[PDB]
Design a protein around this ligand. Structure first.
Ligand code: MG
Ligand code: MG
Ligand code: MG
Ligand code: MG
Ligand code: MG
Ligand code: MG
Ligand code: MG
Ligand code: MG
Ligand code: MG
Ligand code: MG
Ligand code: MG
Ligand code: MG
Ligand code: MG
Ligand code: MG
Ligand code: MG
Ligand code: MG
Ligand code: MG
Ligand code: MG
Ligand code: MG
Ligand code: MG
Ligand code: MG
Ligand code: MG
Ligand code: MG
Ligand code: MG
Ligand code: MG
Ligand code: MG
Ligand code: MG
Ligand code: MG
Ligand code: MG
Ligand code: ZN
Lengths: 58, 50, 113, 113, 81
RNA sequence: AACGUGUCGCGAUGGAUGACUUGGCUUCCUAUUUCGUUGAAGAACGCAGCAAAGUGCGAUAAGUGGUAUCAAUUGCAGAUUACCGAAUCUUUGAACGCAAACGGCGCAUGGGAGAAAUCCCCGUGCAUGCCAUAUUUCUCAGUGUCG
RNA sequence: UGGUUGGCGUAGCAAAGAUCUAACGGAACGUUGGAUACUGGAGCGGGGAAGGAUUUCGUGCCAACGGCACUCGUACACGAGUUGUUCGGAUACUGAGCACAACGUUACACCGUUUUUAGGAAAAGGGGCAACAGAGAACCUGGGAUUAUAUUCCAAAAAGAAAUUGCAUG
RNA sequence: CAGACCUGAGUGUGGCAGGACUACCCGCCGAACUUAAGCAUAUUACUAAGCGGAGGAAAAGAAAACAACCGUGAUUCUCUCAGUCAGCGGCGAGCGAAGAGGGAUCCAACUCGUUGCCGAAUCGGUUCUUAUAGGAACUUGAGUUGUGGCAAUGGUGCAGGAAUGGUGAAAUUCAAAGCAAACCCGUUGCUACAUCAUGUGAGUAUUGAGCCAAAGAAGGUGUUAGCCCAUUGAGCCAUGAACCUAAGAGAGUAGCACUGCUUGGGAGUGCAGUGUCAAGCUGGCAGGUAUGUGUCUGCCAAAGUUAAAUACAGAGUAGGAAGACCGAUAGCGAACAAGUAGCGUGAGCGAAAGUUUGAAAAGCACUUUGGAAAGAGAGUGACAUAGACCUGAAGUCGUGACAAUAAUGGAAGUACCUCCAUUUCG
């Protein structure tokens, strides 16, 4: 996800939990050279990242 | 090198996404004046010394 | 949008989150037309929603007794000078002698034939 | 008054100003039906050009293109090089409203004019 | 070797961008700005250079609020209740 | 002969000239006309379905609301214009909680999410100086004066 | 001030030894194989600081630029790319130093001392800053993990193995 | 000693200050270049820069003023006084006012302290009346180490207005090149070019006839437009607040000495420093040559406010009116994404650029060659030697044809050529 650049990791977990209803075992963000922040959030194994992404319209 | 205050990274980030050719469709508007971007920057030429 | 104002606080808040949740999904679609129309409906609800609070804090602090205690975001901003200037209430003050010497000789109207 | 001012107020007119400033005379059948002289142009009022190459050519107003000071007509068009037909612009003072598109607001424009 | 070969000797920065003016005039070693005179509260402004006074005076920017308060003084600060 | 020179006809290069001029300059006027700690001007970063710049705006982001106005905007697509009251107004900046090539860090207050509390986000307050006041008259300090 | 000119297709493009071949590509220099040399570990090597700030990578492109040429490029266009409890930095050291406060001086603070004739504790000597080479500093490898990042990514047999901080738990 | 006061802290509370702008304006600061044909005083100039501050103006202002009159009467400004038979000045260069007078402005004046008579009558806060009333009650809270008085409005209601806006008029898209040589005759008469092939943009032009006009006032529209469009008048129309209906009378003060700046100010114009430092029982200050003295005249300083007439000499906000101005190397640096690109460590410097194709993009589809760029046709348009571009100069170059054989140049002929002129059928 591009995620708000001022957001931190713990807030991105709490946001995935609320927006997409899924746990994030980890969320290591980077801010892009362009200035957008980019989170790679890894889901808990109990949550598929595939079943969820397609549910997301992706 | 690696070191950048994020404030400088936000500025090079700013100038980076600002460093783009004018949209094609903008030239097709009525009364349009713009053709080329007059503020294209190149790292090897103009320096954004931050 | 008049309908947007009939809604109560939470009825707005619930009406609002469904816009954000739907504004977000257009952003997902965008990465791969109503997004403007949604974005400005969210702005309507914050407009209506931020108005009820200012309209209900002007209500909390209505009356002379608390008007000095009012949050100054709600206090009538003019210019820094209009506020610091003497008010007519204190501007037009005149010393008691002057008050009497203006009653004793009022600017009586006249003409000259 | 002065030319730069008068001529600037025109080429920098708001779309507000352009609809009035880009009005058309009514055809005599309307200028008899209504004591109005000229009336601002709108979509779907039938018109006939009366000046230029498309002189005498009646047609409905496909669009009032105020940014271009023109008034596209259903019949006033020309084929492009590729064969796609495109509307050709025309200036509303060059035409004559043959049949204006009435409604509640527009009716009032006539009643107060 | 005072020419092109001593141009290679110069490696630092005297000035980084200022937090106020945004000019690359913040002398990093004397933490101040050559342009705005920052961190000093009153901004640098000289009458021997009005080409520069003009260059950074009000109206040079958004006048973000000043547009609002100007409109208000023109409208007598007319207000809804 | 050739080259070179020269006249003329065309043509290229060039951008004068002429016409144009939503610009400047100068003069004059008008007024319910003069910013900011209620956060100013400036600077930053952002916001459009395609938008770099410019303009507009400020996470309500080329706008929200009120008003008038009307049928458009218009590159394409898709379903406005003008003004002004209500708001919105991000990071900063006098900048002021402490810093600052740090998108850092506080204390207090309330909220939030959350979670086996700790962490995490958020709002508000928290600079200095000075004046007033302690309106139910705050707490004090002085081998100052007395009692 | 703009444009143009002769000189002039001239002066040159001669520093660092170097390319050759076939095949393919292409509209016509690249790619691979082979050959041949060179650098020669104080390297036309592999990583960093400063600086640069997208040059990175892939695809395409080669109009312009790469002083010859380009099919190639650090160029152009489009799309990508930088992942950290432990790396570095800050949170959290002090140093040469600096300077807010106060105080003082100055017609004036944009000066000076750096503690203040000074009541600086809010639950003996005010506050702060100042080192990405000093002090400090809990993490390692393997990967079949990328076009491009990895001491950062990997997934339940975490490839795995740790150490560590906070709170809490038996 | 409990407290009390005085002095001083600490928090809480309510406020303000700091920044910007700074054209003009107020205070300080303060050059030099220049001029003097050198140069130091002088001048530039009490200027620039520098510092600090305001406001919509500011500052000034209500007599310690002028005069010397038949007297005037705050200030500012203005014309004049006056470039002065003032004055300053190496009496040089130079500098240089004021009274009066005409005028603008002006129903322009007031307030403290003090004195006298009172003596909390005051203020702040609290409550209260639809009100942080100029009201009322209440308060030790401040205040007698002196507030205040005397003499020398707030609340609610309606409307109108004004002012801005909102609205709003006439009349052709009529008809289809000339001659008649002042007007009337006269609403009348009379009059191709570059066999084939194309070629004339738009009618605001011409003409003829009308027409409107309290509107001819300029702009737009494909040509030059009263009548195609837009503009304005009247008339109406709406609006949030606003706007209009006996005593006293100023003390480190004034003066004076010295110094310094300053001024036309001259034995001192103002000032500042320091020293000194009054008077008010022949008072004090001014009365433009010092001193002592005597008359007379005007004044009454050392506290305060104060509109208008005035500045805006590199400001702003919102509008407006203009021009014997510039016309894209001009006018602002900037007619354009201009204080932009770019440049400089920086302070700062700082461009060029007219998208003026056309009426409209109708912006050259399609065929053809080319890898392409492009080319040849074709097409659009009135024109594409109007093609992303009005015009399209010079110079330079290419090409064709032609005359030909240091340059240029002058004179005069002649040879050849002349899309030239005139003349002749002389
Ligand atoms: Mg990270
Ligand atoms: Mg270089
Ligand atoms: Mg850098
Ligand atoms: Mg040197
Ligand atoms: Mg060195
Ligand atoms: Mg943009
Ligand atoms: Mg701060
Ligand atoms: Mg050669
Ligand atoms: Mg070797
Ligand atoms: Mg590459
Ligand atoms: Mg590039
Ligand atoms: Mg030290
Ligand atoms: Mg440190
Ligand atoms: Mg170290
Ligand atoms: Mg570390
Ligand atoms: Mg790599
Ligand atoms: Mg100030
Ligand atoms: Mg001299
Ligand atoms: Mg000055
Ligand atoms: Mg005044
Ligand atoms: Mg005064
Ligand atoms: Mg007088
Ligand atoms: Mg003088
Ligand atoms: Mg008194
Ligand atoms: Mg004295
Ligand atoms: Mg002098
Ligand atoms: Mg006196
Ligand atoms: Mg120019
Ligand atoms: Mg041309
Ligand atoms: Zn700065």
């Amino acid at each position: 996800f591009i995620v708000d650049s001022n957001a931190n990791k713990t807030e991105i977990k709490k946001a995935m939990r609320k927006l997409y209803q899924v746990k994030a075992v980890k969320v290591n963000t980077l801010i892009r050279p362009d200035g957008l922040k980019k989170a790679y959030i890894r889901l808990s194994a109990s949550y598929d990242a595939l079943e969820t992404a397609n549910k997301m319209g992706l | 090198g690696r070191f950048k205050p994020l404030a400088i990274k936000k500025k090079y980030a700013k100038k980076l996404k600002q460093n783009r050719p004018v949209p094609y469709w903008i030239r097709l508007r009525t009364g349009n004046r713009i053709k080329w971007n007059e503020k294209r920057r190149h790292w090897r030429r103009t320096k954004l010394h931050y | 949008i008049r309908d947007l104002r009939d809604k109560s606080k939470d009825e707005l808040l619930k009406q609002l989150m469904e816009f954000k949740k739907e504004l977000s999904q257009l952003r997902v679609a965008q990465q791969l037309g109503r997004i403007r129309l949604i974005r400005k409906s969210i702005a309507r609800i914050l407009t209506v929603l931020n108005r009820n609070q200012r309209e209900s804090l002007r209500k909390v602090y209505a009356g002379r007794r608390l008007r000095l205690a009012m949050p100054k975001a709600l206090r009538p901003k003019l210019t820094r000078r209009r506020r610091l200037a003497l008010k007519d209430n204190e501007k037009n003050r005149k010393t008691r002698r002057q008050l009497r010497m203006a009653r004793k000789f009022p600017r009586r109207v006249y003409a000259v034939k | 008054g002065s030319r730069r001012k008068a001529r600037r107020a025109h080429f920098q007119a708001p779309s507000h100003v352009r609809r009035i400033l880009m009005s058309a005379p009514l055809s005599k059948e309307l200028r008899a039906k209504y004591n109005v002289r000229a009336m601002p142009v709108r979509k779907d009022d039938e018109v006939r050009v009366k000046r230029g190459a498309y002189k005498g050519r009646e047609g409905k107003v496909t669009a009032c293109y105020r940014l271009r000071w023109v008034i596209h007509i259903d019949k006033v068009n020309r084929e492009k090089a590729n064969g796609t037909t495109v509307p050709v612009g025309v200036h509303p003072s060059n035409v004559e409203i043959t049949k204006l598109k009435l409604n509640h607001n527009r009716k009032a424009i006539l009643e107060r004019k | 070797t005072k020419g092109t070969t001593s141009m290679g000797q110069r490696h630092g920065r005297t000035h980084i961008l200022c937090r106020r003016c945004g000019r690359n005039a913040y002398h990093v070693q004397w933490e101040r700005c050559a342009a705005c005179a920052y961190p000093r509260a009153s901004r640098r402004r000289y009458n021997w250079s009005v080409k520069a006074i003009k260059r950074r005076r009000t109206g040079t920017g958004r006048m973000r609020y000043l547009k609002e308060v100007n409109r208000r003084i023109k409208n007598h600060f007319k207000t809804s209740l």
